[PDB]
Design a protein around this ligand. Structure first.
Ligand SMILES: CCCCOc1ccc2c(CC(=O)O)coc2c1
Length: 188
């Protein structure tokens, strides 16, 4: 077949019931994740190839970066609770990987302050049980598939994108193959 298990995607041995339809995992420490954001805009390009209104979910992971990795999962929970993902994604990626100015939880908070989130609002979210539950939700989704690598995308809890099987001589062709694979998997 044109699309084959092991080429553009793999199939989970144990599918996850009730999973998000399109579920992405990333780390702000992850170099390909930085590219998926700033260079390729994978999430945007997948969204454009899917029907309007499809639920896309994006979660942070703990397993890169030790203490700060977990702080960043909690900060991503704050971003989701406040709805400010689009305001903080690029400065968090650049703070961790480009300028390397993010070395502590306080430095993460600085990114939100600079992006216009009030200190009181950030701190109240950071310490809220709503955010505690969002941290648990991110961990559970990753645990459901023993995730050991990012960037990762899962479709309907059943299929995992396999970017290592896609063309990388051309960045736009790669994005198109990735997005068309998501569309194919979503229609299975
Ligand atoms: C999870 C461990 C890493 C393996 O998974 C990959 C392999 C290659 C790529 C490229 C290529 C590009 O666009 O420059 C973008 O993301 C990738 C993820």
């Amino acid at each position: 077949a044109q699309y084959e298990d092991g080429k553009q995607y793999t199939t989970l041995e144990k599918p996850v019931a009730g999973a998000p339809q399109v579920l992405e995992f990333f780390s702000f420490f992850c170099p390909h994740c930085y590219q998926f954001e700033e260079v390729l805009h994978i999430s945007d390009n997948v969204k454009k190839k899917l029907p309007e209104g499809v639920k896309m979910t994006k979660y942070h992971v703990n397993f890169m970066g030790g203490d700060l990795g977990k702080d960043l999962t909690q900060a991503w929970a704050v971003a989701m609770a406040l709805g400010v993902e689009d305001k903080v994604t690029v400065p968090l990626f650049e703070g961790v990987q480009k300028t390397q100015t993010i070395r502590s939880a306080s430095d993460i908070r600085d990114v939100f302050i600079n992006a216009g989130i009030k200190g009181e609002e950030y701190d109240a979210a950071w310490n809220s049980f709503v955010v505690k539950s969002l941290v648990a939700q991110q961990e559970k989704a990753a645990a459901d598939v023993q995730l050991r690598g990012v960037p990762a995308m899962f479709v309907n809890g059943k299929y995992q994108l396999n970017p290592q099987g896609m063309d990388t001589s051309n960045m736009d062709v790669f994005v198109q193959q990735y997005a068309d694979t998501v569309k194919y998997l979503s229609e299975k």
